[PDB]
Design a protein around this ligand. Sequence first.
Ligand SMILES: CNc1nc(Cl)nc2c1ncn2Cc1ccccc1NS(C)(=O)=O
Length: 164
Amino acid sequence: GTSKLKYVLQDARFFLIKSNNHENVSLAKAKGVWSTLPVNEKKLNLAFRSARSVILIFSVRESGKFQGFARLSSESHHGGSPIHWVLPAGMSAKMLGGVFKIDWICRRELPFTKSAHLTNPWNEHKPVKIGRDGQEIELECGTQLCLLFPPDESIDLYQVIHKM
Ligand SMILES: CNc1nc(Cl)nc2c1ncn2Cc1ccccc1NS(C)(=O)=O
């Protein structure tokens, strides 16, 4: 059902994550990690201490879709395994250094056409699909967005709930 998901989302914070390519989102789904640019890395570290759950909602640039959502399980960390991200032009590995661990809540896609009725107060009430990497999504809009995704019956939210 949707009851455990609603519990995880209670009083959560939500952030839009934008990726230039599918390869990096596939790697994030396989390994449970994400890296972002230093400005957003600072914002996410602050949010992680401030909320029971910090939810990252992923969208690959030019895909017209969200590719799923995940909960931060840690602040960013350095020096571990260099993740083999595909880097866009003008992007170095030292800029994507700093690895967050994430627990996927939904690995299913949602087309932007399905979220056209949701606007984000923190981005001038533009449709929630609009935003830069790291754009915060207000609680009510983020909750409704996450509830639009198809259920991912391959995920048991029991272990996620314990980490709260
Ligand atoms: C593994 N982490 C990432 N991997 C990829 Cl391939 N792209 C990312 C990632 N993190 C943020 N981006 C988007 C981006 C790339 C370059 C310059 C600015 C921006 N941010 S923007 C204009 O809002 O889209």
